[PDB]
Protein backbone atom coordinates (compact mmCIF):
# COMPACT_ATOMS: atom_id res chain seq x y z
CA UNK A 1 0.00 0.00 0.00
CA UNK A 2 1.01 3.72 -0.10
CA UNK A 3 2.35 4.81 3.36
CA UNK A 4 3.52 8.20 4.73
CA UNK A 5 5.30 7.67 8.11
CA UNK A 6 5.76 10.98 9.98
CA UNK A 7 8.36 11.47 12.78
CA UNK A 8 7.25 11.07 16.46
CA UNK A 9 5.71 13.89 18.59
CA UNK A 10 8.00 16.73 19.78
CA UNK A 11 7.80 18.68 23.16
CA UNK A 12 10.03 21.78 22.81
CA UNK A 13 11.05 25.11 24.52
CA UNK A 14 10.14 28.47 22.83
CA UNK A 15 12.50 30.22 20.31
CA UNK A 16 13.70 26.63 19.57
CA UNK A 17 13.51 24.88 16.10
CA UNK A 18 12.11 21.40 15.06
CA UNK A 19 12.38 19.16 11.90
CA UNK A 20 9.34 16.89 11.07
CA UNK A 21 10.09 14.01 8.60
CA UNK A 22 7.62 12.26 6.20
CA UNK A 23 8.97 8.92 4.80
CA UNK A 24 7.06 7.87 1.62
CA UNK A 25 6.69 4.33 0.16
CA UNK A 26 4.46 2.25 -2.20
CA UNK A 27 4.55 4.85 -5.04
CA UNK A 28 7.39 6.53 -7.08
CA UNK A 29 8.45 9.47 -4.80
CA UNK A 30 8.96 11.99 -7.70
CA UNK A 31 5.38 11.57 -9.18
CA UNK A 32 3.56 13.62 -6.48
CA UNK A 33 4.28 16.83 -4.56
CA UNK A 34 4.36 16.63 -0.72
CA UNK A 35 2.05 19.29 0.84
CA UNK A 36 2.22 20.23 4.58
CA UNK A 37 -0.85 21.20 6.67
CA UNK A 38 -1.03 22.72 10.22
CA UNK A 39 -4.05 21.54 12.29
CA UNK A 40 -4.76 24.23 14.95
CA UNK A 41 -5.46 22.55 18.31
CA UNK A 42 -9.14 23.69 18.54
CA UNK A 43 -10.32 23.31 14.87
CA UNK A 44 -8.88 24.65 11.54
CA UNK A 45 -6.38 23.57 8.83
CA UNK A 46 -3.71 25.94 7.39
CA UNK A 47 -1.84 24.99 4.16
CA UNK A 48 1.93 25.61 4.85
CA UNK A 49 3.31 24.86 1.34
CA UNK A 50 4.37 22.02 -0.99
CA UNK A 51 7.59 20.48 -2.35
CA UNK A 52 7.35 18.77 -5.81
CA UNK A 53 10.30 16.29 -5.98
CA UNK A 54 11.90 15.82 -9.41
CA UNK A 55 10.69 19.21 -10.58
CA UNK A 56 12.19 21.18 -7.58
CA UNK A 57 9.09 23.52 -7.46
CA UNK A 58 8.57 24.75 -3.83
CA UNK A 59 5.53 26.96 -2.98
CA UNK A 60 5.09 28.51 0.52
CA UNK A 61 2.00 30.16 2.09
CA UNK A 62 3.01 33.85 2.77
CA UNK A 63 1.83 33.33 6.43
CA UNK A 64 4.64 30.65 6.79
CA UNK A 65 7.42 32.34 4.69
CA UNK A 66 10.14 32.52 7.42
CA UNK A 67 8.57 30.00 9.86
CA UNK A 68 8.69 26.86 7.65
CA UNK A 69 11.41 25.52 5.30
CA UNK A 70 10.75 22.35 3.16
CA UNK A 71 13.78 20.06 2.30
CA UNK A 72 13.69 16.57 0.61
CA UNK A 73 16.07 13.50 0.50
CA UNK A 74 15.31 11.62 -2.79
CA UNK A 75 17.69 8.67 -2.03
CA UNK A 76 15.38 7.68 0.94
CA UNK A 77 11.95 9.01 -0.32
CA UNK A 78 11.62 11.48 2.63
CA UNK A 79 10.16 15.04 2.81
CA UNK A 80 11.21 17.32 5.70
CA UNK A 81 9.72 20.51 7.14
CA UNK A 82 11.71 22.63 9.63
CA UNK A 83 9.95 25.19 11.90
CA UNK A 84 12.08 28.06 13.42
CA UNK A 85 11.54 30.62 16.26
CA UNK A 86 8.78 28.45 17.82
CA UNK A 87 6.14 30.29 19.92
CA UNK A 88 3.08 28.58 21.54
CA UNK A 89 1.29 29.69 18.27
CA UNK A 90 3.11 26.77 16.55
CA UNK A 91 1.67 24.18 19.04
CA UNK A 92 -0.40 22.04 16.59
CA UNK A 93 -0.44 18.67 14.74
CA UNK A 94 1.49 18.86 11.41
CA UNK A 95 0.49 16.58 8.49
CA UNK A 96 2.33 15.75 5.25
CA UNK A 97 -0.01 14.79 2.35
CA UNK A 98 0.48 13.79 -1.35
CA UNK A 99 -0.79 15.94 -4.31
CA UNK A 100 -3.86 18.28 -4.53
CA UNK A 101 -6.91 15.82 -4.64
CA UNK A 102 -5.61 13.39 -7.41
CA UNK A 103 -3.56 11.22 -4.97
CA UNK A 104 -4.97 11.30 -1.40
CA UNK A 105 -2.60 9.91 1.23
CA UNK A 106 -1.84 11.65 4.53
CA UNK A 107 0.75 11.10 7.26
CA UNK A 108 -0.63 10.05 10.71
CA UNK A 109 0.40 13.58 11.85
CA UNK A 110 3.20 14.86 14.15
CA UNK A 111 2.11 16.76 17.31
CA UNK A 112 4.40 19.71 18.22
CA UNK A 113 3.83 21.10 21.79
CA UNK A 114 5.80 24.28 22.84
CA UNK A 115 6.24 25.04 26.64
Amino acid sequence: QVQLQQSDAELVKPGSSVKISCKASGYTFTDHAIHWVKQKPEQGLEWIGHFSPGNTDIKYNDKFKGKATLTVDRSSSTAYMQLNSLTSEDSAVYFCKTSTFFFDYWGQGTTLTVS
Binding site: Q43, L45, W47, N61, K63, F101, D104
Partner: protein
Protein backbone atom coordinates in the same frame (compact mmCIF):
# COMPACT_ATOMS: atom_id res chain seq x y z
CA UNK B 1 -8.87 34.86 -0.95
CA UNK B 2 -11.18 33.99 2.06
CA UNK B 3 -13.25 30.75 2.55
CA UNK B 4 -16.15 31.19 5.07
CA UNK B 5 -17.82 28.00 6.40
CA UNK B 6 -21.06 27.77 8.36
CA UNK B 7 -22.04 26.65 10.80
CA UNK B 8 -18.82 26.42 12.97
CA UNK B 9 -20.40 23.37 14.63
CA UNK B 10 -23.80 21.60 14.80
CA UNK B 11 -25.40 18.64 16.64
CA UNK B 12 -27.66 16.05 14.93
CA UNK B 13 -29.19 12.69 15.78
CA UNK B 14 -28.06 9.85 13.48
CA UNK B 15 -30.69 9.49 10.70
CA UNK B 16 -31.32 13.24 10.26
CA UNK B 17 -30.22 15.22 7.16
CA UNK B 18 -27.60 17.98 7.57
CA UNK B 19 -26.27 20.80 5.32
CA UNK B 20 -23.14 22.96 5.67
CA UNK B 21 -22.21 26.00 3.54
CA UNK B 22 -18.89 27.25 2.09
CA UNK B 23 -18.72 30.82 0.62
CA UNK B 24 -15.53 32.15 -1.08
CA UNK B 25 -14.71 35.89 -1.58
CA UNK B 26 -13.74 35.21 -5.24
CA UNK B 27 -15.26 32.71 -7.77
CA UNK B 28 -13.60 29.22 -7.89
CA UNK B 29 -15.13 28.62 -11.38
CA UNK B 30 -12.34 28.14 -13.99
CA UNK B 31 -14.04 28.52 -17.47
CA UNK B 32 -10.80 26.93 -18.83
CA UNK B 33 -12.40 23.49 -18.09
CA UNK B 34 -15.73 24.85 -16.60
CA UNK B 35 -15.19 23.24 -13.11
CA UNK B 36 -15.45 24.79 -9.61
CA UNK B 37 -12.06 24.06 -7.86
CA UNK B 38 -13.62 23.44 -4.42
CA UNK B 39 -12.64 20.36 -2.32
CA UNK B 40 -14.34 18.90 0.82
CA UNK B 41 -12.32 17.01 3.49
CA UNK B 42 -13.76 14.91 6.35
CA UNK B 43 -11.44 14.80 9.41
CA UNK B 44 -12.41 12.37 12.19
CA UNK B 45 -10.73 12.77 15.62
CA UNK B 46 -7.26 11.15 16.04
CA UNK B 47 -7.14 10.89 12.23
CA UNK B 48 -5.81 12.71 9.19
CA UNK B 49 -8.22 14.48 6.81
CA UNK B 50 -9.82 12.30 4.07
CA UNK B 51 -10.96 13.54 0.60
CA UNK B 52 -14.81 13.50 0.20
CA UNK B 53 -15.61 15.67 -2.87
CA UNK B 54 -13.53 17.51 -5.54
CA UNK B 55 -14.72 19.91 -8.33
CA UNK B 56 -17.58 20.96 -5.93
CA UNK B 57 -19.76 17.87 -6.72
CA UNK B 58 -17.56 14.87 -7.79
CA UNK B 59 -17.33 12.24 -5.03
CA UNK B 60 -13.94 10.54 -4.37
CA UNK B 61 -13.67 6.71 -4.74
CA UNK B 62 -15.13 4.77 -1.74
CA UNK B 63 -17.20 7.71 -0.31
CA UNK B 64 -20.94 6.84 0.18
CA UNK B 65 -23.73 8.39 -2.00
CA UNK B 66 -25.23 10.06 1.19
CA UNK B 67 -22.53 12.82 0.75
CA UNK B 68 -23.58 15.26 -2.05
CA UNK B 69 -21.58 18.38 -2.89
CA UNK B 70 -23.28 21.17 -4.87
CA UNK B 71 -23.02 24.91 -5.72
CA UNK B 72 -20.89 26.91 -8.20
CA UNK B 73 -19.12 30.31 -8.28
CA UNK B 74 -18.73 31.50 -4.66
CA UNK B 75 -21.58 29.56 -2.92
CA UNK B 76 -21.21 25.77 -2.23
CA UNK B 77 -22.94 23.21 0.06
CA UNK B 78 -22.11 19.75 1.43
CA UNK B 79 -25.21 17.67 2.35
CA UNK B 80 -25.30 14.39 4.32
CA UNK B 81 -28.73 12.96 3.38
CA UNK B 82 -28.77 10.66 6.47
CA UNK B 83 -26.02 11.19 9.14
CA UNK B 84 -24.44 7.94 10.46
CA UNK B 85 -22.34 7.47 13.68
CA UNK B 86 -19.30 7.00 11.36
CA UNK B 87 -19.81 10.62 10.03
CA UNK B 88 -18.76 12.29 13.34
CA UNK B 89 -15.95 14.54 12.00
CA UNK B 90 -14.93 18.13 11.16
CA UNK B 91 -15.73 18.99 7.49
CA UNK B 92 -13.34 21.44 5.74
CA UNK B 93 -13.73 23.08 2.30
CA UNK B 94 -10.44 23.97 0.55
CA UNK B 95 -9.81 26.43 -2.32
CA UNK B 96 -7.98 24.32 -5.00
CA UNK B 97 -8.19 27.22 -7.57
CA UNK B 98 -5.23 29.55 -6.68
CA UNK B 99 -2.31 29.73 -4.18
CA UNK B 100 -2.42 29.90 -1.22
CA UNK B 101 -4.71 26.82 -0.97
CA UNK B 102 -6.90 28.27 1.85
CA UNK B 103 -9.28 26.11 3.95
CA UNK B 104 -12.50 27.12 5.73
CA UNK B 105 -12.48 27.11 9.56
CA UNK B 106 -14.56 23.91 9.22
CA UNK B 107 -18.02 22.67 10.31
CA UNK B 108 -17.75 20.27 13.30
CA UNK B 109 -20.50 17.55 13.26
CA UNK B 110 -21.34 16.12 16.76
CA UNK B 111 -24.05 13.48 17.56
CA UNK B 112 -26.73 13.04 20.32
Amino acid sequence: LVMTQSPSSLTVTAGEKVTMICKSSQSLLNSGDQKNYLTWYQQKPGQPPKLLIFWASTRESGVPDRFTGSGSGTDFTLTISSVQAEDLAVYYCQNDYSYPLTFGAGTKLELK
